[PDB]
Amino acid sequence: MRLEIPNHTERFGVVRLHEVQRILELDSGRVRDESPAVGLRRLDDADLRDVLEQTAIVVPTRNERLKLLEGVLSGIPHEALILVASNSSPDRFQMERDLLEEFAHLTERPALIFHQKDPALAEALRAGGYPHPIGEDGLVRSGKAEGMILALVFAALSGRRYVGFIDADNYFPGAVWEYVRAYAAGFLMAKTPFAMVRILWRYKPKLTEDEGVVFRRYGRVSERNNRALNQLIGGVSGFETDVVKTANAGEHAMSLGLALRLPLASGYAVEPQELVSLLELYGGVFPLEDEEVLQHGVEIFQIETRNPHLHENKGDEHIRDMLLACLATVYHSKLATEEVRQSVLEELQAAGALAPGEEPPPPVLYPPLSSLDLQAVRKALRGHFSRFRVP
Amino acid sequence: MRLEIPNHTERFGVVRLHEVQRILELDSGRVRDESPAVGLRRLDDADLRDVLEQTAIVVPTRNERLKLLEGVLSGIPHEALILVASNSSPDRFQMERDLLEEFAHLTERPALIFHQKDPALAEALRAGGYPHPIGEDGLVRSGKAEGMILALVFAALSGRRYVGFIDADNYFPGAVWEYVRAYAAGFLMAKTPFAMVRILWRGVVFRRYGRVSERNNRALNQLIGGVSGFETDVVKTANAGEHAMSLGLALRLPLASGYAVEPQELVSLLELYGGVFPLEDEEVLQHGVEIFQIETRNPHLHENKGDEHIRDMLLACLATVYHSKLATEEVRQSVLEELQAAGALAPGEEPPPPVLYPPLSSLDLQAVRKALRGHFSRFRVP
Numbered sequence: 001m002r003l004e005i006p007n008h009t010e011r012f013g014v015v016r017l018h019e020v021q022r023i024l025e026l027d028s029g030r031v032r033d034e035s036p037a038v039g040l041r042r043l044d045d046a047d048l049r050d051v052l053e054q055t056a057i058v059v060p061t062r063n064e065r066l067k068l069l070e071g072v073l074s075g076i077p078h079e080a081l082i083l084v085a086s087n088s089s090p091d092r093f094q095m096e097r098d099l100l101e102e103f104a105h106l107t108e109r110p111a112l113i114f115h116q117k118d119p120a121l122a123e124a125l126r127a128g129g130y131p132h133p134i135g136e137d138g139l140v141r142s143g144k145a146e147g148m149i150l151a152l153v154f155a156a157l158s159g160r161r162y163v164g165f166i167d168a169d170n171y172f173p174g175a176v177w178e179y180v181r182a183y184a185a186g187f188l189m190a191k192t193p194f195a196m197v198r199i200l201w202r203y204k205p206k207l208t209e210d211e212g213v214v215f216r217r218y219g220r221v222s223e224r225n226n227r228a229l230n231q232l233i234g235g236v237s238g239f240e241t242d243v244v245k246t247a248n249a250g251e252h253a254m255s256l257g258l259a260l261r262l263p264l265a266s267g268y269a270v271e272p273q274e275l276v277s278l279l280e281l282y283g284g285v286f287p288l289e290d291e292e293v294l295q296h297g298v299e300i301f302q303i304e305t306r307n308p309h310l311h312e313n314k315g316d317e318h319i320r321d322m323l324l325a326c327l328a329t330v331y332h333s334k335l336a337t338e339e340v341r342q343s344v345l346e347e348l349q350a351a352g353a354l355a356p357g358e359e360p361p362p363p364v365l366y367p368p369l370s371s372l373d374l375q376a377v378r379k380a381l382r383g384h385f386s387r388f389r390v391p
Numbered sequence: 392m393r394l395e396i397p398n399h400t401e402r403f404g405v406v407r408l409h410e411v412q413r414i415l416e417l418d419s420g421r422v423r424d425e426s427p428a429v430g431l432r433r434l435d436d437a438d439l440r441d442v443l444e445q446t447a448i449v450v451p452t453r454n455e456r457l458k459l460l461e462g463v464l465s466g467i468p469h470e471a472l473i474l475v476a477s478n479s480s481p482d483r484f485q486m487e488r489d490l491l492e493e494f495a496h497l498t499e500r501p502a503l504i505f506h507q508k509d510p511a512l513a514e515a516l517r518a519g520g521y522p523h524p525i526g527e528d529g530l531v532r533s534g535k536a537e538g539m540i541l542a543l544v545f546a547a548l549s550g551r552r553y554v555g556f557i558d559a560d561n562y563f564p565g566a567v568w569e570y571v572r573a574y575a576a577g578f579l580m581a582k583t584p585f586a587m588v589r590i591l592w593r594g595v596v597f598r599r600y601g602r603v604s605e606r607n608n609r610a611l612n613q614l615i616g617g618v619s620g621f622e623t624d625v626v627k628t629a630n631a632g633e634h635a636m637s638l639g640l641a642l643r644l645p646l647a648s649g650y651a652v653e654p655q656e657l658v659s660l661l662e663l664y665g666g667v668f669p670l671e672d673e674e675v676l677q678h679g680v681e682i683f684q685i686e687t688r689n690p691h692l693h694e695n696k697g698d699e700h701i702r703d704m705l706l707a708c709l710a711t712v713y714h715s716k717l718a719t720e721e722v723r724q725s726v727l728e729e730l731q732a733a734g735a736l737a738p739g740e741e742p743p744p745p746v747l748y749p750p751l752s753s754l755d756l757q758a759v760r761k762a763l764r765g766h767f768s769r770f771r772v773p
């Protein structure tokens with residue numbers, strides 16, 4: 001993989017937020033003659049695969065088409081682990097298990113699969129002193145955040161350093177292959193054990209070009225979200241930026257060391273929160289206690305894939321609460337300067353937030369997973385790793 | 392790349408058509424030991440790239456969106472030689488050389504690019520005593536067939552062993568990638584210098600298109616079954632535009648001119664090597680021919696309009712069959728019914744016979760290198 005090298009990079013504390021870098025070439029072969037290009041970077045295949053051997057790839061599902069989900073698997077680079085995180089119909093789950101075993105069997109490759117509403121998992125967490133997501137029904141509640149918590153525990157238990165997430169909603173297994181290598185690309189390029197890789201794919205329309213009156217309005221929001229994020233940064237920085245182009249980077253990857261360090265939000269605020277949290281924690285505008293991070297800093301990679309991201313999902317409550325969740329997390333940052341709060345307030349109640357006079361509900365964040373006793377977890381799950389493990 | 396073993400295999404003279412193999416895993420990684428569970432074929436990435444290192448990838452273009460074409464190039468594996476075969480409008484073509492020079496520069500890799508209508512390329516073939524594709528205006532005529540001819544020439548000249556074609560129409564570089572790797576996979580499973588790889592992929596108009604194809608592949612299995620005496624289901628890729636093939640095999644095939652190429656390709660393999668005729672090719676008689684049909688994980692989203700475009704695709708195809716010197720009476724017969732049953736015309740009406748170009752072996756490369764001598768560098772892209 002050849003990548004362009006971000007011409008600019010945003011320094012915010014010990015955070016290093018790099019501009020969007022385009023993938024120039026998907027598979028740039030086996031390097032022998034290095035030629036040193038200053039402007040771009042050629043990732044050697046074998047390096048990429050070595051990173052991927054240390055990577056778990058989480059593929060969440062809640063009653064996704066199987067045909068699609070299986071197609072997503074075929075495309076995942078061989079070296080990566082593969083964890084299917086499930087919240088599907090009791091019996092749909094069963095099919096997914098069957099689907100994964102067959103695949104893993106045939107591809108001679110290891111995999112785990114688990115279910116959000118599994119009670120063992122609920123016990124596992126509270127044994128490790130992290131009861132924070134358990135429902136009243138006595139088990140880990142549904143939610144995006146809740147999913148990741150389970151994902152990161154398995155990543156951890158499995159001994160991988162890197163974990164990244166793929167949307168099973170993808171007609172294109174080749175697109176998946178690129179997205180995963182791009183994570184590897186990111187961690188390769190990275191120079192600190194605290195790293196995040198956030199994929200995007202961005203598209204230019206026009207007056208004489210079709211997109212449907214719903215793909216259009218989807219761009220109109222991410223643009224604003226990214227905006228609201230640079231508004232937050234700029235607010236602290238004093239210098240107006242435009243570096244975040246990935247506020248809603250659902251498909252993202254993150255070194256476990258970084259992952260376990262961040263808090264997490266429940267709704268659509270997740271992706272946007274990640275960023276906010278990183279800046280709150282490592283922006284400098286606060287005492288930062290953590291030695292190793294302050295010492296190596298954080299790099300956030302924003303990589304632009306060659307393949308279109310075509311995931312089937314739309315309508316109001318999607319695209320709308322998409323907006324509300326995000327600008328709420330900004331309004332509430334411990335980093336917001338008054339003008340940032342206000343600028344953001346307006347877009348909300350002047351697009352429905354029931355005014356005048358109204359505030360978004362604050363973020364509801366889980367605490368970092370560093371908290372969680374992993375040994376207690378390993379002890380608490382002894383007699384069940386059979387059933388998570390797919391031979 | 393892991394893929395399924397083909398269920399069965401049609402032996403026909405020294406030709407063997409393999410049944411479809413589904414790609415199961417996009418990238419199987421690096422083998423260092425084996426439990427090669429013979430259910431499937433696991434293919435090492437080193438071996439794949441070693442093959443790619445001797446493969447030309449032709450990308451034709453006739454006035455293609457440019458973003459669309461860059462995209463495609465980005466998805467070609469590194470080890471492959473990139474051949475852009477243009478017949479675009481004059482300055483669209485200038486944009487093309489530009490686009491490719493910038494690509495190949497930044498990605499540190501060799502490309503070729505030529506324009507079908509270039510006067511030097513006429514001379515070049517003249518000299519090598521293959522004057523056939525040159526037309527009235529003293530230039531090579533437009534057409535799928537003619538494109539390929541020029542493309543095989545460069546492939547040859549540049550000493551690559553395998554040539555594959557790829558459709559610039561693709562919205563997904565990641566698809567391109569799987570495609571080109573698929574080609575390599577075929578050659579790597581090939582147990583013969585002479586091999587073919589054909590890619591396939593299993594809207595009321597798409598329906599009409601799907602149907603037209605079912606019918607095309609049918610006609611091709613009747614042709615086969617007609618000679619062996621036993622019905623075969625094999626051949627699912629009668630119209631497989633995206634195919635690769637080994638140069639040895641390419642320079643040996645005659646070439647039908649337009650919408651008839653891919654089917655004719657199959658027909659000719661059978662006439663020539665299917666053992667019903669005098670076969671003098673010490674090498675082909677002795678290594679034989681493998682045809683691979685590979686089903687890709689990645690869909691094919693080539694925008695292809697015109698309803699009648701597809702009608703043409705049909706007549707095109709049943710024509711090559713009707714006219715094979717291998718069609719029994721009853722094959723010649725069914726095809727016919729079927730045809731005039733939606734076109735062809737009259738109570739009866741013999742579809743036009745195929746205008747074929749003869750094999751490119753009939754050509755003298757060194758004459759050609761001679762003639763292209765002072766020019767190889769407007770074709771070579773630094």
Ligand SMILES: [Zn+2]
Binds near residue numbers: 007019
């Ligand atoms: Zn810049």
Ligand SMILES: [Zn+2]
Binds near residue numbers: 251
């Ligand atoms: Zn995506």
Ligand SMILES: [Zn+2]
Binds near residue numbers: 398399624625
């Ligand atoms: Zn069959």
Ligand SMILES: [Zn+2]
Binds near residue numbers: 674677678
């Ligand atoms: Zn021999």
Ligand SMILES: [Zn+2]
Binds near residue numbers: 558633691693
């Ligand atoms: Zn295709």
